[PDB]
């Protein structure tokens, strides 16, 4: 049985436990290609099911995702409860290495759900986004305000009747009254944000213009002297509407938009989308495709980690390793330009493979990079990372344990510095990552800034090892799958065969027809766990594209970890998270 087959997952022990606890008629099991058990739970039993999953012998401890779906235009809803809207909750049990997707059906008029924040604190931002984009009200939320769009915005963007394009709307006119009105909206008021204010609590504004490579955003700070008593991040300043474009572009033409989700990730961002689309299409890619995609993912991972370490060192105060790390990034960029033809957004992965074959001479450039990198990395450590001033700025700053990382959905180096060995490449292997010998570094139990930075250095070394294994063992074979839905087909057969020309003609003009199904793929990105949840209605466009990013979780974890610290501690914590605002807002 192939890995893309539709499964109901009735053999999962959680399904039997829920049968024994709530009864057989309490919920509906849905067979999907997501790989997870999808259970349609009634709305009034949602908190009971959440408590039961949180109190299992091996509990479901992390709310991976929480969002909504407009089911009004969905025609192929066979075997599903009647719904105008739906809210889905993706929950991960790490001890079982399993996960479950609860779904709550909602009518168009009664768009209210009990809030999930009493079980998982990341439901705050997740439900704020679900209210902002779908209009679904969550009863009991401490503050249900818009998180992506401004407060003076009419309508909910992710509804199916909301027009997507800016050309549908009037063109942007900036008048004096409009500038004054929008400048009034961006002003901060203590009472509206739930600050809950002593005649000394001053207020500090950080953004929204940001002198750093990772986006533009605001943090409003409540200060007692220099101590941060409370803070709430202001996001949505980098909102690009990428999921609405997922509903607006075809399966093949959406890949450049998948590139700019985490713009330091590139092919790492392309990987889960093409894997989920191949799950929708029933495509198993050959081994050469898997090794090529692993090689490019590790190259872009080293690029992102180099930028992150350089930016952290610059934010500490040493400004020379950013120059040297960008030189190493230029070496990586030389190899990436040779392979794909572009630097930061290659858009080179395809449904069924990659756009081209590897060019002649890729092994030479990979050899130069593999010889160049480790001495430069050792010089980085000895020059800046072992500096005691940097250690004093970094060690013990904004520290949290395993419980705080689990309850806030923090993944990547922040989770693994708490001692939790959870990498997607080893727990739920994808794209032939089980054929590569590499280790997953873990921390002692405390997630300092310094511990996260040293962990990312360790994953840079492990990615260099994976790149060496890719260089030594690259199979000879096709760079594209032989499936009929491989988009586009191989170019020369398109250029001399009429049936291949027909397939290419219809795949690049109207789009390839994915059969109506739901698919899901989570990967270990450069900054944590990045996932694509794709709902297809049988058309050539995605019915729903849900992109889960870890930077959302880390920016939400900021107020819990930086509370009671200094402003410079906040700057160091921002520099040591490895986020980008495109990942947060997307």
């Amino acid at each position: 049985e192939p890995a893309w087959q539709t499964r109901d997952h009735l053999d999962d022990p959680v399904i039997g436990e829920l049968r024994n606890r709530f009864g057989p008629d309490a919920f509906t099991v849905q067979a999907t290609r997501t790989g997870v058990p999808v259970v349609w739970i009634k709305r009034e039993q949602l908190l009971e099911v959440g408590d039961f999953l949180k109190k299992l012998p091996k509990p479901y401890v992390m709310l991976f995702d929480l969002h909504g779906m407009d089911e009004r235009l969905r025609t192929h809803r066979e075997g599903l409860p009647a719904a105008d809207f739906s809210v889905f909750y993706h929950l991960i049990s790490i001890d079982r290495n399993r996960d479950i997707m609860l779904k709550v059906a909602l009518a168009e008029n009664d768009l209210h759900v009990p809030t999930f924040t009493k079980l998982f604190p990341n439901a705050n931002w997740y439900e704020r986004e679900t209210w902002d984009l779908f209009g679904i009200t969550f009863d009991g939320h401490p503050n249900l305000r818009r998180i992506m769009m401004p407060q003076t915005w009419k309508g909910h963007p992710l509804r199916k009747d909301y027009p997507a394009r800016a050309t549908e709307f009037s063109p942007f006119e900036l008048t004096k009254a409009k500038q004054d009105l929008e400048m009034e909206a961006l002003t901060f008021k203590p009472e509206e944000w739930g600050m809950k204010r002593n005649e000394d609590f001053m207020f500090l504004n950080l953004g929204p213009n940001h002198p750093s490579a990772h986006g533009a955003f605001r943090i409003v700070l409540q200060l007692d002297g220099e101590e941060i008593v409370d803070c709430v991040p202001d996001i949505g300043y980098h909102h690009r509407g990428a999921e609405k474009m997922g509903e607006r572009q075809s399966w093949h033409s959406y890949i450049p938009y998948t590139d700019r989700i985490e713009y330091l990730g590139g092919c790492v961002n392309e990987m889960p989308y093409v894997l989920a689309v191949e799950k929708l299409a029933g495509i198993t890619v050959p081994d050469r495709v898997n090794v090529i995609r692993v090689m490019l993912s590790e190259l872009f991972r080293i690029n992102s980690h180099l930028l992150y370490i350089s930016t952290f060192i610059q934010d500490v105060g040493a400004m020379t390793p950013v120059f040297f790390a960008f030189t190493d990034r230029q070496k990586i960029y030389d190899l990436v330009e040779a392979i794909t033809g572009f630097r930061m957004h290659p858009a080179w992965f395809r449904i069924g493979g990659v756009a081209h074959d590897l060019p002649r001479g890729w092994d030479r450039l990979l050899r130069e990079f593999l010889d160049w990198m480790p001495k430069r990395l050792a010089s980085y450590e000895k020059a800046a990372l072992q500096n005691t001033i940097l250690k004093g700025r970094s060690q013990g700053v904004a520290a949290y344990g395993a419980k705080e990382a689990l309850e806030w959905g923090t993944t990547g180096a922040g989770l693994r510095a708490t001692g939790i060995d959870f990498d997607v490449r080893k727990a739920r292997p994808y794209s032939g990552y089980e054929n590569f010998d590499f280790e997953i570094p873990v921390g002692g139990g405390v997630s300092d800034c310094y511990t996260r930075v040293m962990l990312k250095v360790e994953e840079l070394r492990q990615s260099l090892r994976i790149l060496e294994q890719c260089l030594n063992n690259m199979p000879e074979g096709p760079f594209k799958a032989d499936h009929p839905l491989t988009t586009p087909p191989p170019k020369e057969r398109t250029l001399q065969h009429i049936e291949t020309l027909i397939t290419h003609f219809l795949q690049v003009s109207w789009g390839p027809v994915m059969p109506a199904n739901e698919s899901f793929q989570m990967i270990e990105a450069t900054k944590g766990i990045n996932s694509y949840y794709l709902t297809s209605d049988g058309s050539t466009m995605s019915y729903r594209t849900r992109i889960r990013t870890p930077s959302y979780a880390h920016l939400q974890q900021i107020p819990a970890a930086i509370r009671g610290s200094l402003v410079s501690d906040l700057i160091v914590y921002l520099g040591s998270i490895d986020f980008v605002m495109s990942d947060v807002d997307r």
């Binding site: 394009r165 050309t167 009929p484 009429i498 027909i502 109207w510």
Partner: protein, 905 residues
């Protein structure tokens, strides 16, 4: 009937075959050679499924779903491995000889063969040998021929010969060298040959008029509209790119014009793309032509209309109901004149009285095909109402259909049906002044003057029912033919009488009404069909008003010092000299039109109105069904200087500026509500289409497909800044792809058919409730009137027989599908298909005049001598001269008139 497809139970119709039943359930089976309108032949061998004998069967056998009835307790599998492999093998065999032609093929992105190649999953070529080739033929100005792309599915020959009744297209040759086309290079002679561009699943037959300015299907802005080239009212999908009307596609209407249009509607759209059309309001000041925008045009027109003592409005049957009503409100009901002549108006009002007061049901265009005997009186149906002629051909083949039904042969097995009913056919009796195109299937044809055709109808009605007035002076041969017609009509369960106003005789319509009443009095299920002239002739007749002659006398007597002519050239309904003199006498002439007419030189103000491609409105077809047509594109999107509005918008803004000195344009639903409130006879036009607030789950209806391209580059030469998307406040459609075009959406107006995996015109199968039936949530359009409880009385005005008087020549009307329509002659692609202007003469009349065939003779009508070449019409009765109506210089009101000093030039 109960079928089991892939283990799932379905309830279907046992009279259907498995292919149409499975397509009606939403299942996907590839097919080429089967068409819903043409039946099953089992040629392409593409629709193969695996049938099992019982439920506990594993082997099965490959059967063909188009050739297998969907009987009760059937067990089939589509996704069986052997069936899938065979369908992929059939696609592969079709792909062995196919040219590498998709980029340079007009069917690309709209191709059924592309969709079925992708659907079967065939994308790897292992055939390594040569491909057969074919030379192409010249098939005329409308159809482009490319025989390399053929897959030998026999759809073209089956449609063209069995369905359309054409003769000049056929299949030639042998084993793998089958050729589909004409026996020699020449123009395709069928009036419905343009449907080959949608019948052919490949790019062998293509729209050459579209192939000139070609663009792909995904790049088209589509709208649901009504064809304006005659009175039948076929539903069309006009598609536009870069500000010009690119194509006309057949929009499915199961009640009217299901799969097929005629050539005049499909290729006569070229007047919209003319460069001489008015695009801005122009005011004449001496020898100067000042171009204004809409506001100062309304201000100036309001001042000149207010200074006038009496304003009159001349409408047209070309314009919509809303525009004629807006003109009628602007000038007043008593000052509103229909733009047609007095005789035309009398014939049209008599036809309306027969339709909505005669107590006899008027069938729809699809319902015509279910009648058992057809009598056509006076109307050349193929040249005036061509789709009615196609439906008449289907009704004629109904006898072979019922003969095969009597032998327990299924209705989709068309080859056995045609084999059983070899040449037996339902009775068809056509009357005209000469030969018609229905003569090949007619049981009888009467070539006689209009008085003699009317007398034949009156004699038929008297012989059917003796209470009808009798005719004295019937010859024994004519009496025998009348007895044959009466014996055929009396024995028919569903007789149909087809007449119209194009014959130019009131007595023909009276005779047809008498025949219909006599057949109704015997208890038969008689239907009557009246063929009008223009698209909204019935609506203009229902709205009413004075004739054009009364308006001309009002202009000539000086009682009216201001005339507003709405979309009327005025030369087709009256003599040109009289119209020109009456318009030159009036101190204010305002012409609201979308075409450069001849009366615009004398016009003081010209309002650049919109055509059907740039306007919304309602038109009433020949059966009294109100139908809403929607705007295709914004004219001012590309050319920002273009001020071209709807005619009702122009006139309503003019009325508001005349009353209150302020400019309010309208919304369309306001005009619809005003029509319903003021005219109770036109109260049904509100329910023709839903209003502008109609939404499908909150979103509007998309005019263009979801993969529409070039949005940031279509206007980049004018300005790199992307303009505002055109807003449509009038209707529920949007000028964008951000809308709904789902096949399961609860609506009746479909701009275009597209489904995932179905890019061809076969997506209409996805848009129907059952394949070949109606639209899923009802066809658009509503009948304005029901059948009356009681009928009319017998028309006792039996005309005298035609007497050929010396020195006077009765003008026998001749109509041409390419040339008689006012707007279709303006289309430049028609001039190659438009015939030369001749005049028809009897052999006896030509011998008396001493003229041969081809020589030029000159005749004077209303003091205007014009010369024409001569053909010898054998079937034309002596004492008559045959003129082609609607031509250049020959107005359609000349039908039934008389001619003086017709002599050789």
């Amino acid at each position: 009937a109960t079928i089991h497809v892939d283990g799932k139970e379905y309830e279907v119709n046992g009279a259907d075959n498995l292919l149409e039943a499975c397509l009606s359930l939403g299942l996907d089976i590839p097919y080429f050679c089967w068409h819903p309108a043409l039946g099953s032949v089992g040629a392409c061998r593409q629709c193969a499924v695996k049938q099992y004998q019982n439920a506990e069967d594993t082997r099965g056998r490959l059967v063909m779903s188009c050739m297998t009835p969907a009987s009760d307790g059937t067990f089939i599998s589509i996704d069986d491995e052997e069936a899938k492999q065979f369908r992929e093998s059939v696609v592969e065999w079709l792909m062995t000889n196919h040219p590498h032609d998709c980029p340079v093929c007009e069917e690309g992105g709209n191709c059924h063969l592309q969709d079925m190649t992708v659907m079967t999953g065939h994308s790897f070529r292992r055939y390594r040998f040569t491909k057969r080739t074919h030379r192409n033929q010249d098939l005329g100005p409308f159809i482009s021929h490319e025989m390399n792309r053929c897959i030998a599915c026999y759809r073209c020959v089956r449609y063209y010969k069995d369905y359309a009744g054409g003769t000049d297209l056929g299949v030639y040759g042998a084993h793998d060298n089958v050729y589909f086309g004409r026996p020699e290079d020449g123009t395709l002679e069928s009036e419905f040959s343009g449907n080959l561009v949608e019948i052919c699943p490949t790019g062998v037959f293509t729209d050459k008029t579209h192939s000139e300015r070609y663009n792909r299907k995904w790049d088209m802005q589509f709208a649901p509209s009504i064809c304006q080239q005659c009175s039948i009212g076929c539903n069309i999908s006009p598609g536009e790119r870069y500000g010009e009307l690119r194509r006309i596609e057949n929009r499915y209407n199961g009640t009217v014009n299901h799969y097929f249009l005629c050539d005049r509607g499909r290729f006569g759209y070229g007047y919209v793309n003319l460069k001489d059309r008015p695009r801005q309001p122009v005011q004449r000041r001496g020898d100067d032509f000042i171009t204004l925008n809409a506001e100062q045009a309304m201000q100036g027109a309001a001042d000149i209309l207010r200074q006038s003592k009496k304003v009159i409005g001349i409408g047209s049957p070309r314009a919509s109901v809303e525009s004629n009503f807006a003109l009628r409100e602007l000038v007043g009901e008593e000052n509103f004149y229909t733009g047609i002549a007095h005789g035309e108006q009398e014939r049209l009002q008599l036809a309306l009285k027969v339709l909505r007061e005669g107590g006899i049901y008027t069938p729809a265009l699809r319902e015509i095909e279910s009648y058992d005997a057809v009598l056509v009186l006076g109307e050349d149906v193929t040249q005036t109402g061509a789709r009615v002629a196609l439906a008449v051909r289907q009704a004629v083949k109904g006898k072979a259909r019922e003969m095969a039904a009597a032998q327990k042969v299924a209705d989709w097995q068309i080859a056995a049906i045609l084999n059983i009913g070899q040449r037996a056919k339902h009775p068809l009796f056509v009357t005209n002044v000469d030969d018609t195109r229905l003569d090949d299937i007619a049981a009888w044809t009467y070539r006689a003057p209009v008085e003699d055709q009317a007398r034949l109808g009156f004699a038929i009605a008297h012989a059917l029912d003796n209470s009808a007035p009798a005719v004295d002076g019937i010859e024994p041969e004519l009496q025998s033919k009348i007895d044959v017609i009466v014996q055929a009509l009396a024995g028919a369960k569903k007789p149909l009488i087809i007449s119209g106003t194009n014959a130019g005789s009131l007595e023909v319509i009276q005779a047809a009404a008498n025949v219909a009443k006599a057949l109704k009095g015997r208890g038969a299920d008689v239907g009557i069909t009246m063929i009008a002239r223009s698209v909204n002739s019935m609506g203009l007749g229902i709205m009413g008003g004075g004739s054009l002659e009364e308006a001309l006398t009002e202009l000539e007597t000086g009682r009216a010092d201001a005339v507003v002519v709405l979309e009327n050239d005025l030369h087709r309904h009256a003599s040109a000299t009289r119209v020109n003199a009456a318009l030159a006498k009036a101190p204010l002439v305002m012409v609201v039109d979308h075409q450069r007419t001849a009366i615009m030189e004398n016009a003081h103000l010209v309002l650049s109105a919109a055509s059907f491609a740039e306007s919304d409105g309602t038109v009433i077809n020949n059966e009294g069904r109100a139908q809403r047509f929607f705007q295709v594109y914004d004219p001012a999107y590309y050319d920002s200087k273009t001020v071209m509005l709807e005619s009702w918008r122009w006139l309503h803004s003019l009325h508001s500026t005349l009353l209150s000195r302020e400019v309010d344009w309208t919304q369309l639903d306001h005009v619809i509500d005003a029509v319903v409130a003021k005219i109770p006879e036109l109260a049904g036009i509100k329910d023709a289409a839903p209003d502008a607030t109609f939404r499908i789950r909150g979103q509007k209806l998309a005019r263009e497909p979801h993969r529409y391209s070039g949005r940031t580059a279509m206007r980049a030469n004018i300005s790199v800044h992307e303009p505002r998307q055109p807003q449509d406040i009038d209707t529920m459609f949007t000028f964008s792809m951000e809308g709904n075009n789902q096949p399961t959406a609860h609506r009746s107006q479909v701009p275009f058919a597209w489904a995932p995996g179905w890019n061809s015109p076969q997506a209409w199968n996805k848009f129907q409730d059952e394949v070949g039936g109606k639209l899923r949530f009802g066809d658009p359009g509503v009948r304005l009137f029901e059948t009356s409880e009681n009928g009319l009385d017998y028309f006792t005005s039996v005309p005298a027989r035609f007497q050929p008087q010396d020195g006077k020549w009765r003008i026998a009307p001749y109509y041409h599908l390419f040339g008689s329509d006012e707007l279709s002659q303006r289309a430049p692609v028609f001039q190659s298909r438009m015939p030369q202007p001749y005049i028809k003469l009897n052999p006896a009349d030509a011998a008396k005049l001493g003229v041969n065939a081809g020589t030029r003779v000159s005749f004077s009508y209303d003091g205007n001598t014009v010369t024409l070449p001569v053909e010898i019409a054998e079937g034309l009765t002596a004492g008559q001269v045959g003129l082609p109506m609607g031509m250049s210089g020959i107005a359609p009101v000349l039908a039934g008139a008389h001619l003086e000093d017709l002599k050789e030039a």
